[PDB]
PDB file of C-alpha atoms and ligand atoms in Angstrom:
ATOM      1  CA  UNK P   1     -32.286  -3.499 -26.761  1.00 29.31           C
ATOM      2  CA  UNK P   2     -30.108  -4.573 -29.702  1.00 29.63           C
ATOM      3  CA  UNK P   3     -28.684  -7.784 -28.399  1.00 33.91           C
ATOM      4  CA  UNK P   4     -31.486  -8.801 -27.539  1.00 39.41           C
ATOM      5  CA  UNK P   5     -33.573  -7.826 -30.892  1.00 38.14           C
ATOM      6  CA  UNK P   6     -30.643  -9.754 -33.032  1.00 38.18           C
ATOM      7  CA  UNK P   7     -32.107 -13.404 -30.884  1.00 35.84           C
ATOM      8  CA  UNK P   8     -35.819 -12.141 -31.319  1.00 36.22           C
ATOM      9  CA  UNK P   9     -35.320 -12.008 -34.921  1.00 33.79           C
ATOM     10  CA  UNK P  10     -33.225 -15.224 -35.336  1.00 34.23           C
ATOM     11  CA  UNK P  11     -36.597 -17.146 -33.226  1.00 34.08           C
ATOM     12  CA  UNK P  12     -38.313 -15.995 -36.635  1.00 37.58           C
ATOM     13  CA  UNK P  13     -35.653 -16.228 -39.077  1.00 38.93           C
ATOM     14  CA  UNK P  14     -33.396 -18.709 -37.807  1.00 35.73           C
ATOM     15  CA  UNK P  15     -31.019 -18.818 -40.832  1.00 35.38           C
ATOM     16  CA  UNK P  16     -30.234 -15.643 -41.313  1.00 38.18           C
ATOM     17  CA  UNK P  17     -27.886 -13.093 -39.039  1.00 36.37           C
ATOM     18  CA  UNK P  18     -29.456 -10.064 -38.676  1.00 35.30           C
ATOM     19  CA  UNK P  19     -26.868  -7.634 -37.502  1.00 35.20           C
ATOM     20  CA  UNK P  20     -25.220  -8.310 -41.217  1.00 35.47           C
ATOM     21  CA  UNK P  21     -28.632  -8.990 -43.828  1.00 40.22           C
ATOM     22  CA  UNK P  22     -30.984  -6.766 -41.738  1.00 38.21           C
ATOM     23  CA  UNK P  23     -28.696  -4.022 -41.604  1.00 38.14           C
ATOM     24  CA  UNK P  24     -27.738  -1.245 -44.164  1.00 41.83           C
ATOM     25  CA  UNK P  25     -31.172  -1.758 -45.962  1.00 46.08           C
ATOM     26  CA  UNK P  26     -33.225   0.713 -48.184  1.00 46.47           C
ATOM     27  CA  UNK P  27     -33.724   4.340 -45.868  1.00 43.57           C
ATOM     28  CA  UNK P  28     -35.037   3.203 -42.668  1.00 46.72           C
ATOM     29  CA  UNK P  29     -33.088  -0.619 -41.699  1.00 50.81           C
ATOM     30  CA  UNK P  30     -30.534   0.934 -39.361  1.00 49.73           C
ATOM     31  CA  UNK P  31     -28.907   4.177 -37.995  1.00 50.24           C
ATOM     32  CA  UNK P  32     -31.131   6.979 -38.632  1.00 46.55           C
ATOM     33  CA  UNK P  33     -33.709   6.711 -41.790  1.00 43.84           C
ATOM     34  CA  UNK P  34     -35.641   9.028 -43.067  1.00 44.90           C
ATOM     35  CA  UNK P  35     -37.854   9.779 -46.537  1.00 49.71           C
ATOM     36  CA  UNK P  36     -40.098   7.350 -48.365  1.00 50.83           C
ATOM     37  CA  UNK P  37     -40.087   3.256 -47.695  1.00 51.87           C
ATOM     38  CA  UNK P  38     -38.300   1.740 -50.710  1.00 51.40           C
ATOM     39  CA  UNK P  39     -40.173  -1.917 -50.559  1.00 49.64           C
ATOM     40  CA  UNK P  40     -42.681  -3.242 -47.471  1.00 48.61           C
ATOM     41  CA  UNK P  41     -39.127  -4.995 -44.997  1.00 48.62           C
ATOM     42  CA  UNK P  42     -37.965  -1.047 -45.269  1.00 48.66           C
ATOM     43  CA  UNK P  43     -41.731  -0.275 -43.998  1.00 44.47           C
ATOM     44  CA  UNK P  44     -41.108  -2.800 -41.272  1.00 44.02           C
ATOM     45  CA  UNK P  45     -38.040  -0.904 -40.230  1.00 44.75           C
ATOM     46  CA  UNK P  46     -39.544   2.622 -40.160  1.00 45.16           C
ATOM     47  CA  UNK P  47     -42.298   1.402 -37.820  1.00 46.96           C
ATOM     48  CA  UNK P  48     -39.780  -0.293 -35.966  1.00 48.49           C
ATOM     49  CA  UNK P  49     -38.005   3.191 -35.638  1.00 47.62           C
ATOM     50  CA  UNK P  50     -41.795   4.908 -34.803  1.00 47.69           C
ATOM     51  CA  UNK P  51     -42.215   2.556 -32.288  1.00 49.11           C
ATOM     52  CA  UNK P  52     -38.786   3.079 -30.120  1.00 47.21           C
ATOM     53  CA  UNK P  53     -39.655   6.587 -30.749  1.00 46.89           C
ATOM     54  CA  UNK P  54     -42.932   6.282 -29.214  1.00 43.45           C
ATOM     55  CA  UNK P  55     -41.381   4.272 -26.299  1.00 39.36           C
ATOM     56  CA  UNK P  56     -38.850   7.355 -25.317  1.00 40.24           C
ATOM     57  CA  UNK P  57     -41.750   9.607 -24.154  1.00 37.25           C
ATOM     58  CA  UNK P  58     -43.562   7.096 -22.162  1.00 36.37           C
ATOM     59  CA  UNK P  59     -43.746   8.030 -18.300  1.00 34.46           C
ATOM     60  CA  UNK P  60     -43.454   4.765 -17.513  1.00 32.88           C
ATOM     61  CA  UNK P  61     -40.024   4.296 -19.700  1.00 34.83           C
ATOM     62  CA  UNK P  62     -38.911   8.118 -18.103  1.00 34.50           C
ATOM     63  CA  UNK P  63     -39.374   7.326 -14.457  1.00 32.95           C
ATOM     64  CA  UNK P  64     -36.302   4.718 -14.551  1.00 32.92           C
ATOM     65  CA  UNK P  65     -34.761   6.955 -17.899  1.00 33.26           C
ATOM     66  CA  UNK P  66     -32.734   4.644 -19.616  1.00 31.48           C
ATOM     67  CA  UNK P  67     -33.491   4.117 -22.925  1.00 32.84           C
ATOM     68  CA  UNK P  68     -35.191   2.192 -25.994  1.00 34.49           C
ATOM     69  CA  UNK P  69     -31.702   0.870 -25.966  1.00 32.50           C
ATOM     70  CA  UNK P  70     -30.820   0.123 -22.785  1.00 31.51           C
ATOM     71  CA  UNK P  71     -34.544  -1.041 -21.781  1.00 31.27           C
ATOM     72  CA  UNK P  72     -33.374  -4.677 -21.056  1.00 32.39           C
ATOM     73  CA  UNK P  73     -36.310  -7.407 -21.276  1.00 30.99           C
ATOM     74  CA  UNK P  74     -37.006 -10.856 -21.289  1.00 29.73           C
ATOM     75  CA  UNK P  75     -38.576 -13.372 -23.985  1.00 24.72           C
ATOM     76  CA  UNK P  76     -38.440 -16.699 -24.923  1.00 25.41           C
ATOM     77  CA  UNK P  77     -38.486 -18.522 -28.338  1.00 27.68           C
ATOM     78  CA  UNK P  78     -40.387 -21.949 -29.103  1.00 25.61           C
ATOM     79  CA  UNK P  79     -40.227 -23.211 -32.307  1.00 24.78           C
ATOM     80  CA  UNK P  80     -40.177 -19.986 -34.298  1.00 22.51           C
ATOM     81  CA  UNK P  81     -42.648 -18.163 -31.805  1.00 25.40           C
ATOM     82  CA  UNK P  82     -41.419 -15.311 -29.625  1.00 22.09           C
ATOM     83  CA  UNK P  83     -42.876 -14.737 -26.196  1.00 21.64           C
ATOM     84  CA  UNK P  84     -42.500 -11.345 -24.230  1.00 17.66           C
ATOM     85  CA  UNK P  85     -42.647 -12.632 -20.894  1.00 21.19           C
ATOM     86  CA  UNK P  86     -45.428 -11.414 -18.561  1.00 20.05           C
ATOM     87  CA  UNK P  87     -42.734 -10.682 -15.582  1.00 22.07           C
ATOM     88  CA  UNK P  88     -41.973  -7.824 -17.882  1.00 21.69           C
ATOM     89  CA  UNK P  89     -42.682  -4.037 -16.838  1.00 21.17           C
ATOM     90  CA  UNK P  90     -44.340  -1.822 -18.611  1.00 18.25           C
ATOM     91  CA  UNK P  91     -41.870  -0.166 -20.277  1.00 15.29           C
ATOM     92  CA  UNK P  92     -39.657  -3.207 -20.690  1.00 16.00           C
ATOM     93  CA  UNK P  93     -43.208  -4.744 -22.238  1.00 15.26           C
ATOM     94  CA  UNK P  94     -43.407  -2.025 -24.349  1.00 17.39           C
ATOM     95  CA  UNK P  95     -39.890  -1.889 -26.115  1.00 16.61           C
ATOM     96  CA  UNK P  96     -40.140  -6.035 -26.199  1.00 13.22           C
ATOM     97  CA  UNK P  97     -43.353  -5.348 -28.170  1.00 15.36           C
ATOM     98  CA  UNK P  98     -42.055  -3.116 -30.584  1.00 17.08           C
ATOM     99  CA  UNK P  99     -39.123  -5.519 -31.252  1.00 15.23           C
ATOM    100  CA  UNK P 100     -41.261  -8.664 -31.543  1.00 17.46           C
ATOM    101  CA  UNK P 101     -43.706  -6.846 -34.059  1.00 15.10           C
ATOM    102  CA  UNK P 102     -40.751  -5.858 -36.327  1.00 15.09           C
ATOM    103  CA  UNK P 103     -38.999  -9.940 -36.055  1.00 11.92           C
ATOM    104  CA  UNK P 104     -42.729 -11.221 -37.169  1.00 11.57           C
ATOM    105  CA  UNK P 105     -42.488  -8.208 -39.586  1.00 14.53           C
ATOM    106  CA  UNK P 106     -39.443  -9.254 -41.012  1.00 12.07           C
ATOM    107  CA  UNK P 107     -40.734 -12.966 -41.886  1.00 11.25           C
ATOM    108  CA  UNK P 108     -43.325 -12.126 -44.046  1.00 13.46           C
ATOM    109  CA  UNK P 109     -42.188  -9.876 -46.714  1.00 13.53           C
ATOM    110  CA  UNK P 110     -39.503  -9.927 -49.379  1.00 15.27           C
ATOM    111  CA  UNK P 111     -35.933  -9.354 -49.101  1.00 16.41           C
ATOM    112  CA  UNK P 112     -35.299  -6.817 -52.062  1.00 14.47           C
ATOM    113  CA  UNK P 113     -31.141  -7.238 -52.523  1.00 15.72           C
ATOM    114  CA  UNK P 114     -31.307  -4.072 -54.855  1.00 10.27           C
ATOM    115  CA  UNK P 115     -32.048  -2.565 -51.297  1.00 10.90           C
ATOM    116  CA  UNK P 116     -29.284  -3.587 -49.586  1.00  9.26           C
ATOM    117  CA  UNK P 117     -26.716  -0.390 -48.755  1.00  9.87           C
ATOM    118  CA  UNK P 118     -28.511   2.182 -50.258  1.00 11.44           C
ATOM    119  CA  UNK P 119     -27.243   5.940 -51.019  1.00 14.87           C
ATOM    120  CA  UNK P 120     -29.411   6.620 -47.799  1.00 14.05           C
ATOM    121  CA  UNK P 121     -29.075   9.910 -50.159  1.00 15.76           C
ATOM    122  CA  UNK P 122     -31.798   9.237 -52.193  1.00 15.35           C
ATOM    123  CA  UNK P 123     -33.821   8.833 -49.268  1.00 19.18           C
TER     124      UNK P 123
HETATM  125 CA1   CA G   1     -33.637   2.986 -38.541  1.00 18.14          CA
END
């Protein structure tokens, strides 16, 4: 889930808004992406898009069928920490995984401007 990734992400980067500075950056940080990784937060993003990928052909995601997106969860933030909560199912588990690894992802690497709505073109 979206909603849902936009908190995760503000647990680890708490000034920031996400849906506006995490958005529209290099080929891979938002709809679609494809090509090469412009800088290691673009990186982030493509395995961010591998792992939702991943998560749409897992049984366990198919036998309810909605989707990497819809796949609701729970978590909980403590100072700056992000907690998938066990109650979780395994899919649910899954996508909350793949969202938490891309919010600690996002932390620790630089935030490249120059990057920032790309011609997805040169991509
Ligand atoms: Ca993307």
């Amino acid at each position: 889930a979206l909603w849902q990734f936009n908190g995760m992400i503000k647990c680890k980067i708490p000034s920031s808004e996400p849906l506006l500075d995490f958005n529209n950056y290099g080929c891979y940080c938002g709809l679609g992406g494809s090509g090469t990784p412009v800088d290691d937060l673009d990186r982030c993003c493509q395995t961010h898009d591998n792992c939702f990928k991943q998560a749409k052909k897992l049984d366990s995601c198919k036998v309810l069928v909605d989707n990497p997106y819809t796949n609701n969860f729970s978590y909980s933030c403590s100072n700056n920490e992000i907690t998938c909560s066990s109650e979780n199912n395994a899919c649910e588990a899954f996508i909350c995984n793949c969202n938490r690894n891309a919010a600690i992802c996002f932390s620790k690497v630089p935030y490249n401007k120059e990057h920032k709505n790309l011609d997805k073109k040169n991509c």
